[PDB]
């Protein structure tokens, strides 16, 4: 029954221009034994064809086209609802090169385990070969990939999340380099066996081989486990490339802010989860003459341009956002983007009229079907209607405030890099770094509230493709060798400081634009601030609070730098720097010492 690649259907009609790709596809098909092989072209006719099959398989139902044209709801297996960090591996030749923020295993051992799993794993299934491009195709060195997958769901979402298909394949030419990304849901089928809507396995690996730029995923069909451009390529493999090639692959939103001068400023901002970064990516300023547009709300790739400035590009093509919490009052621009359809929803609730719902959304629906397919009732059912990690997957191009520069292969010049976290105490509403190296330290020690303070350096804690210490050194190296006058200024923002009584000291949301105005003015040298031990921090009088009904004492409190509180912060930072291990750069330890000395 085992078939040689040459006789596997679809391989006789395979594209032959690129021999390395073809040989690789043949090797893989020979191992996994799919029923047939399909090279995807990313066309609209292909998209509707795959969707028809997804509807037939029960993976998708078609949402009411009158509310979301060309849109679908998928409900997953309850065991497969999120990225699985403990099953995610960086398999560098040496463990130290994975480092303490990563899960390591010897690459020889990992390959032996996974190749065993892959043997015959696609029996009964179509194997798709999915070419794609991370970033605009017109780029200089475009980052190409090919995902092999046995998941039709994966193919369709990859079409939205990356520039997938014909164009990317042609960009590969006849011998062009590309990231080899392999994926299987690990649910082989017998001939004639009825499949399930959402195949997956209890056994999962999301493995990265940094030296060869390869990704091997098995067992999950969900999000960042299976859409291999999303985190695997965009951050983990890309950070390794960026390390070797002198650029930065980062977990940052990209915001375009326009002043009453009609001058545009571009910012890259890194937050961990639970800091409302999507709200910031799609900011609507509350002060006259200021406007904002978005270039992305997840990944930014930054590279020096001819003029010595850092330019950011969004390597992705779609939004893959967390649904719950998204609503008209807090994020009308996200809702408008979703309203235009072409969206795949995963694990949200279904309304009686074929619309969708999730916790946080307006409407008070009286009855819903929940993410497990069961009846749900307003003010009665005690389980969430949508899964807390449910998703919408939507084209970026239909966002109403998308900046026209979004698809420019050169990217946009970055004036400011922002780091942020949630802190009840200690950390001011906004701080500017003293210089680049201080800024690196500010990013490297990014703290955010956990169940107590979790350190999530540059918001990259679960996403680095190599040693966190070397990563800090890389940041240090890029600044050292740059024109200092051209580097982005670095800031730390905390929208979430609280009074002792638990009040929010800063109203946030749209009012965050007032902080961004200060940031713009600082960049233009048009604003002052206090020189504190932790950096430059504005006083209330430095901020534009005009038109804002707020207690000035609350804003002063949000901006305070208390030396006692920061002396208590020091051993927390010190413990983290020790955890960074032997690769902790001296330049980062220097900034710790300098901060400790300035505090006294
Ligand atoms: Mn993310």
UniProtKB/Swiss-Prot annotation:
It is found in: Cytoplasm. One of its GO terms (biological process) is response to starvation. It comes from the Bacteria. GTP binds at residues 274-279, 391, 422, 509-512. It catalyses: oxaloacetate + GTP = phosphoenolpyruvate + GDP + CO2. Substrate binds at residues 83, 222-224, 273, 389-391. Pathway: Carbohydrate biosynthesis; gluconeogenesis. One of its GO terms (molecular function) is manganese ion binding. The active site is at residue 275. InterPro entries: PEP_carboxykin_GTP_CS, PEP_carboxykinase_C, PEP_carboxykinase_GTP, PEP_carboxykinase_GTP_C, PEP_carboxykinase_GTP_N, PEP_carboxykinase_N. PROSITE patterns: PEPCK_GTP (PS00505). Its cofactor is Mn(2+). Keywords: Cytoplasm, Decarboxylase, Gluconeogenesis, GTP-binding, Lyase, Manganese, Metal-binding, Nucleotide-binding. One of its GO terms (cellular component) is cytosol. Mn(2+) binds at residues 231, 251, 298. Binds 1 Mn(2+) ion per subunit. Its EC number is 4.1.1.32. Involved in the gluconeogenesis, in growth on fatty acids and is important for initiation of infection in the macrophages. Catalyzes the GTP-dependent conversion of oxaloacetate (OAA) to phosphoenolpyruvate (PEP), the rate-limiting step in the metabolic pathway that produces glucose from lactate and other precursors derived from the citric acid cycle. Belongs to the phosphoenolpyruvate carboxykinase [GTP] family. Monomer. This is Phosphoenolpyruvate carboxykinase [GTP]. The gene is pckG.
